[PDB]
Amino acid sequence: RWEGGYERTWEILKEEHHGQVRLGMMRHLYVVVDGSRTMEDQDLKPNRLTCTLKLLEYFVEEYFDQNPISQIGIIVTKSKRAEKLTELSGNPRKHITSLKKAVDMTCHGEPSLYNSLSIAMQTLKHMPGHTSREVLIIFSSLTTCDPSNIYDLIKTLKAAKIRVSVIGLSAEVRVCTVLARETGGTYHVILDESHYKELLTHHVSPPPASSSSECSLIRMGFPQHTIASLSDQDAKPSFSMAHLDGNTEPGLTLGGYFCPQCRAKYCELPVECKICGLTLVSAPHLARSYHHLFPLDAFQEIPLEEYNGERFCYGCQGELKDQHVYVCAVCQNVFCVDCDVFVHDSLHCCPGCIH
Amino acid sequence: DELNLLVIVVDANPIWWGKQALKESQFTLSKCIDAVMVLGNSHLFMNRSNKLAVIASHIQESRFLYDGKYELLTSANEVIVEEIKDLMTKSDIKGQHTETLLAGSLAKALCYIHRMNKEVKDNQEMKSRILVIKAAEDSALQYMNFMNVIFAAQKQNILIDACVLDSDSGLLQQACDITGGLYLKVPQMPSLLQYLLWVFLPDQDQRSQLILPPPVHVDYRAACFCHRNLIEIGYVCSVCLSIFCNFSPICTTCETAFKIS
Amino acid sequence: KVDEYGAKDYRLQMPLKDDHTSRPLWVAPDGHIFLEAFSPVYKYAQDFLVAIAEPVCRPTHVHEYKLTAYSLYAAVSVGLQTSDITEYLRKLSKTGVPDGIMQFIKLCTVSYGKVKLVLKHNRYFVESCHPDVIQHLLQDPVIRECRLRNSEGEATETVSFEVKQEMIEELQKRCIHLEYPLLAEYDFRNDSVNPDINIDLKPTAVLRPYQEKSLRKMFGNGRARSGVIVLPCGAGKSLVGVTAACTVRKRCLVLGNSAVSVEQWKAQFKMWSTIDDSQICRFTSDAKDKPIGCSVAISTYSMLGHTTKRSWEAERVMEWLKTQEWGLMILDEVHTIPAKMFRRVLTIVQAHCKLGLTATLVREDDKIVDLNFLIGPKLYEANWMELQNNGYIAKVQCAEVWCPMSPEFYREYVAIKTKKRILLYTMNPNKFRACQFLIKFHERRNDKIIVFADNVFALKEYAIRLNKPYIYGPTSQGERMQILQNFKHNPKINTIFISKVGDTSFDLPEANVLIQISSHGGSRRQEAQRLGRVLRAKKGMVAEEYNAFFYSLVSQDTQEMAYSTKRQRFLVDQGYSFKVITKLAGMEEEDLAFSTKEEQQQLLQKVLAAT
Amino acid sequence: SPLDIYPKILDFHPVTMATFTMTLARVCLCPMIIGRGNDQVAISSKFETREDIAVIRNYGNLLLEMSAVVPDGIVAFFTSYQYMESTVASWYEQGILENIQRNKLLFIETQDGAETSVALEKYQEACENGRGAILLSVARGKVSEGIDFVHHYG
Numbered sequence A: 001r002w003e004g005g006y007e008r009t010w011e012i013l014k015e016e017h018h019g020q021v022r023l024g025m026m027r028h029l030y031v032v033v034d035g036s037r038t039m040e041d042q043d044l045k046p047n048r049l050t051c052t053l054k055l056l057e058y059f060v061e062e063y064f065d066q067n068p069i070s071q072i073g074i075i076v077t078k079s080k081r082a083e084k085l086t087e088l089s090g091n092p093r094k095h096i097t098s099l100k101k102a103v104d105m106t107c108h109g110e111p112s113l114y115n116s117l118s119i120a121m122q123t124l125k126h127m128p129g130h131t132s133r134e135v136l137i138i139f140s141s142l143t144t145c146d147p148s149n150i151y152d153l154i155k156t157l158k159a160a161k162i163r164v165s166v167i168g169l170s171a172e173v174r175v176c177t178v179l180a181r182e183t184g185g186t187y188h189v190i191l192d193e194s195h196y197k198e199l200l201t202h203h204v205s206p207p208p209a210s211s212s213s214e215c216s217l218i219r220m221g222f223p224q225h226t227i228a229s230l231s232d233q234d235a236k237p238s239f240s241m242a243h244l245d246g247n248t249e250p251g252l253t254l255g256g257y258f259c260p261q262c263r264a265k266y267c268e269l270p271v272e273c274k275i276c277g278l279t280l281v282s283a284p285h286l287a288r289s290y291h292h293l294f295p296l297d298a299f300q301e302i303p304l305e306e307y308n309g310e311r312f313c314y315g316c317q318g319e320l321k322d323q324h325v326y327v328c329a330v331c332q333n334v335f336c337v338d339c340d341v342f343v344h345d346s347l348h349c350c351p352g353c354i355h
Numbered sequence B: 001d002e003l004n005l006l007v008i009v010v011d012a013n014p015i016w017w018g019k020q021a022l023k024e025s026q027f028t029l030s031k032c033i034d035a036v037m038v039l040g041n042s043h044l045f046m047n048r049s050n051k052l053a054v055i056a057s058h059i060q061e062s063r064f065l066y067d068g069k070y071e072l073l074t075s076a077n078e079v080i081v082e083e084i085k086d087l088m089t090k091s092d093i094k095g096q097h098t099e100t101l102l103a104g105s106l107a108k109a110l111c112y113i114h115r116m117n118k119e120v121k122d123n124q125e126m127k128s129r130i131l132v133i134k135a136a137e138d139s140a141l142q143y144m145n146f147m148n149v150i151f152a153a154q155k156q157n158i159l160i161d162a163c164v165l166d167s168d169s170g171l172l173q174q175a176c177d178i179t180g181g182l183y184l185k186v187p188q189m190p191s192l193l194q195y196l197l198w199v200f201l202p203d204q205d206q207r208s209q210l211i212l213p214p215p216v217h218v219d220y221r222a223a224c225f226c227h228r229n230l231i232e233i234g235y236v237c238s239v240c241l242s243i244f245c246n247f248s249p250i251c252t253t254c255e256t257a258f259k260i261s
Numbered sequence C: 001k002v003d004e005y006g007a008k009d010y011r012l013q014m015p016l017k018d019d020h021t022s023r024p025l026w027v028a029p030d031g032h033i034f035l036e037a038f039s040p041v042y043k044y045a046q047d048f049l050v051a052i053a054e055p056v057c058r059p060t061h062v063h064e065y066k067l068t069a070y071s072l073y074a075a076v077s078v079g080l081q082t083s084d085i086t087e088y089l090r091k092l093s094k095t096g097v098p099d100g101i102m103q104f105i106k107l108c109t110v111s112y113g114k115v116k117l118v119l120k121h122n123r124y125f126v127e128s129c130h131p132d133v134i135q136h137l138l139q140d141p142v143i144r145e146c147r148l149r150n151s152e153g154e155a156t157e158t159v160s161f162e163v164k165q166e167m168i169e170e171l172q173k174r175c176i177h178l179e180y181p182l183l184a185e186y187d188f189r190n191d192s193v194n195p196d197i198n199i200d201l202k203p204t205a206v207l208r209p210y211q212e213k214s215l216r217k218m219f220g221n222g223r224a225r226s227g228v229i230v231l232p233c234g235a236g237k238s239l240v241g242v243t244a245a246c247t248v249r250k251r252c253l254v255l256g257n258s259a260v261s262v263e264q265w266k267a268q269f270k271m272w273s274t275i276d277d278s279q280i281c282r283f284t285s286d287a288k289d290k291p292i293g294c295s296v297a298i299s300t301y302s303m304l305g306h307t308t309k310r311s312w313e314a315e316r317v318m319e320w321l322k323t324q325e326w327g328l329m330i331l332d333e334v335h336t337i338p339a340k341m342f343r344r345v346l347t348i349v350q351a352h353c354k355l356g357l358t359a360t361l362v363r364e365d366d367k368i369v370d371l372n373f374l375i376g377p378k379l380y381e382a383n384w385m386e387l388q389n390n391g392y393i394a395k396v397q398c399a400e401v402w403c404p405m406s407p408e409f410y411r412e413y414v415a416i417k418t419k420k421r422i423l424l425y426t427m428n429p430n431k432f433r434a435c436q437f438l439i440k441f442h443e444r445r446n447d448k449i450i451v452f453a454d455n456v457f458a459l460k461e462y463a464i465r466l467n468k469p470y471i472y473g474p475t476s477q478g479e480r481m482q483i484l485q486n487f488k489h490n491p492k493i494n495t496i497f498i499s500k501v502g503d504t505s506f507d508l509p510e511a512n513v514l515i516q517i518s519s520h521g522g523s524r525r526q527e528a529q530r531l532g533r534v535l536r537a538k539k540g541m542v543a544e545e546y547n548a549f550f551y552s553l554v555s556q557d558t559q560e561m562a563y564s565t566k567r568q569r570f571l572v573d574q575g576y577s578f579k580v581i582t583k584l585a586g587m588e589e590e591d592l593a594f595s596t597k598e599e600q601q602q603l604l605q606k607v608l609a610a611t
Numbered sequence D: 001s002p003l004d005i006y007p008k009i010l011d012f013h014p015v016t017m018a019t020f021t022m023t024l025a026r027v028c029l030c031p032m033i034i035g036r037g038n039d040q041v042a043i044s045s046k047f048e049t050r051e052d053i054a055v056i057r058n059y060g061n062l063l064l065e066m067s068a069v070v071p072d073g074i075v076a077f078f079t080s081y082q083y084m085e086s087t088v089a090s091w092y093e094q095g096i097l098e099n100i101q102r103n104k105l106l107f108i109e110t111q112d113g114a115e116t117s118v119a120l121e122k123y124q125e126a127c128e129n130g131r132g133a134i135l136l137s138v139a140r141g142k143v144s145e146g147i148d149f150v151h152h153y154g
């Protein structure tokens, strides 16, 4: 009976650092990603698959940047089964290539937590005690098919000291919450792509070390870039072991990196030696993670009016006009918002402290 | 849209230049300053979009330095000369600190580059590179902080070019190897400018077609903290990453016993 | 005054005020209005112009509307006075409103609804509150002849007077000449002669915002008013009519174009109204039902336009209809009404409220001005692009495909000069190849392919060579629906060739690919209506701006081009664009018919055989 | 909700009639009313409209979308047993119920006490086992009487 009378005339009106604690010095991270039907949903544009894989490549890059001696494993769970998409290794380029290839995957079926976790545990069952065993799982669908009991696998993982972290997309799942809590991991829910990136960045940093974690004196070798010149009569090329297991022609270079333990030749670093198991690293790789050992504390934010000192930034001489000026804790210098954000995020050291 | 920034860090240690002046050699600090200014003028000459940043590395602090001649070039040279004379004239040695604040100057340069990039509009991409001239001896304690700089540049993909004058620095060699910048020691100091122009002046894309001397060999040996000797294979601590030549039950640094049953 | 460049220098008569960007309207003293869609006040101005002005062009950014006496009458009968309209115009006009337009609006509005026509006791009376107007009008000879004569030939005496039934439309035209248009207002609630009917709205009925807006604009102050509402096919226009009938709840008569239209109207009434099927009858020659107790009678114009003797039962039903007085009458496909035989139907039937619904209102014979008083003012016309944005209908992908002429065919076409040239270009081998390639591509895409061909012979040859179902003049209705269901249900067959009967002679299942080969030859409304009816809203590709595909094959360097640009002009008025596709990608690899010219010359033989 | 009907129902005059409003720093409840379906059908549960096919189909669509979206714990209270059974039968015939089963496991109570107990046990086990479980009961049934739902159940 809305037809009695109606006019739009009235419409027409004028008008997070923790304590100084032990961390994951060596990490063996396995990433399991759902390949179910729900991966085609539009929770994140364009779909879960594309955004997830792009952020996964970014996560791999950042994780290898901050964890030189770590490893990454990629497993895709679809159709109630798991596929070991990528082996656990330290090559960033290979993992990025695999993720780009999997961008065109077929999202079908349902995730299988039991199978994926069993495969990951079997892979990590023989890992050394000192190396941390951490697993990250991205859960799209709320339903999982279990060919056996799941809680027994949880007990086995807890006995194996394997950490499990879950970042879902839809909402909270009781089983995932229990798995994250019991094994010591963290369970998170994605609000958007920005929150997805934040969670991935938080998972990039080494986790705090467990009490039961061992502290062993591991032996590592540091070979140099021994390059053989044809001007020398001892310029004998040899195919690199990493390149040898390749479809194309392996790199037949005159020199490179030779293992100090078994004289194995590798053209890429940091790579653990295949033959003798020696962890072949470089000195910058070790120093690359020292900022974790020595985190930079947050600076004191003081309003410009209440800051009765200098009006220029110490790091860029910028004429400070912002309402917030950040003062260092140690040398108490003057830094603008940009410098305060960048130094803590990237530089990790205050120049005045060095001075 | 190609904005090339060539930040130049000058080793302005008064002690090394005083030693050189007493030697009465052909090359002095004035020639170094003139060569740096000429190189910066040429860099600004090569394109309008190019930008120049000059910071002097001194023990007391790191100084942001910046008639028939170009107006902007003349003004910039006047400002640089004024700042360097103000710093050196007031440079009073108060303390035994001899090693120059190399790491601090690099950090300030990185902060300046970041600020410029933030000020740079999205319409243009600002390629950035840093050229550093090494005159005095290298520093030891800065090493770790120096490393914090290197990856930071590699974080933003910024080339770091080293120009050793007298004292070689393996740290600079490794930084150039990592960031991809060019490392080369000048054989004849009076010929410095041509080395700057012929090698360090062209940009990497220009360097791509150019033929340049091959990079120097770089070693990555380690020091065994209990003796700091060269070591091939060592025992790495899983707690604080301290390296030892022989097996130890307790780490000296982390003070955590190695729980090996 | 005209500039040397030819544009009209209206700047002198338009005092521009500084509120430029704020106000969105330009009001030229010619009577035309221009609106900018990007303006923040677009919605308010949109509704105001729709209420007062008749839209002309609605492209993406800037729209042109026009002011007509009928538009002003519609605005007044909605309930808006002159002062409010002037105030709102000046509040939205970028420049000052010219005094000429002001005076025109004053003159139009000052006399609107002055004269009242009443249908009571099966008699038509003319009455008003200004007896001087009526008395002065008596001097008009046409009014003298229209006035009912006594048994002795004398004239019959707010006192009204009866008027001859046959002379209604004569009075309709005459009153316009008398500058005193009649008022088509009905006592919606004050009715007592015709009781209501046990018919209501089912809860499944949904009124989309534009539908409800149009209905409420029709129901000015709760009283139904005669008029015409323009909605795209499948936008619930039939549902809108059903809803209006349910609201009126009085005796209802509906007229459709063909038997299929009557069947669809009956199905829609059953689908949404609570009227019992005992009160629904179809006055057709096949399904005969008793008119008595028939609350809603559905028929066609021909069933009422039969000048020749009908069947005996049909005569009785016509007598029953003539005796009965209808509170509501509904006419579909209003564009066919201006024909003389169908216009006589309005005189034949005595009804209070007549409402017309259609997809287009541009008859190529420009017989639309009379329709403004045959039924009434244009009540509503939804913005096609706006409905596309809301997803109520599919967002069509229009395209015109040019087909080169074979040299022999083109030489023959130039050789002939009479009307016989139609066959040659409609049988272009390159056009055949293009149509075949399109059909193959869309079948490989699994698309609903409907191919139109107005020429009988061309349709036959094309469909037979492509081996697809064809429907034309014979169109055995049982086999017609058999073919329709085969297209609807069988996925193996999804390519239907339809002759001119596809316009209104039957029901078109919703499709996605419509390929038009031959057209009437300038019927800018007919084939545009065919496009609108063929392509309907489909789920799945609503987000994309191109979910429906339309191709128009035109032969290059023929007169057909001159037709296409002449025709799609109407669709240009709705903002639709047509990108020229001279060449089709992929035709080379896929093998198509007439690859050899030796086949093509045999085709030429066949065509020239039929002169 | 009414504080005066109870003194009338129980025919007495209570000394104190005080209601304690709930204060929450974090919103834990999201009450919503959906009187319009996908087809804009006026959703109602009058016994005249309880037999309407459109209402049943809209209810099926709502349940399917909720199962596809909301987590495992789903409970649906109808108005009567016969109406619920007819609606379930209609959903099975339409096939909408099959998609709901594909998304989440379904459990329907009957008049048998043991069958309802088994259904509740299976529902709780599925909810705690990570598989979506949906329960269908009546407002006057035993489920609404003495069954409590935890956070992961309700």
Ligand SMILES: [Zn+2]
Residues within 6 Å of the ligand: A259, A260, A261, A262, A263, A264, A273, A274, A275, A276, A277, A278
């Ligand atoms: Zn080895």
Ligand SMILES: [Zn+2]
Residues within 6 Å of the ligand: A313, A314, A315, A316, A317, A318, A335, A336, A337, A338, A339, A340, B111
């Ligand atoms: Zn700053």
Ligand SMILES: [Zn+2]
Residues within 6 Å of the ligand: A328, A329, A330, A331, A332, A333, A350, A351, A352, A353, A354
């Ligand atoms: Zn500091």
Ligand SMILES: [Zn+2]
Residues within 6 Å of the ligand: B237, B238, B239, B240, B241, B242, B251, B252, B253, B254, B255, B256
């Ligand atoms: Zn240690």
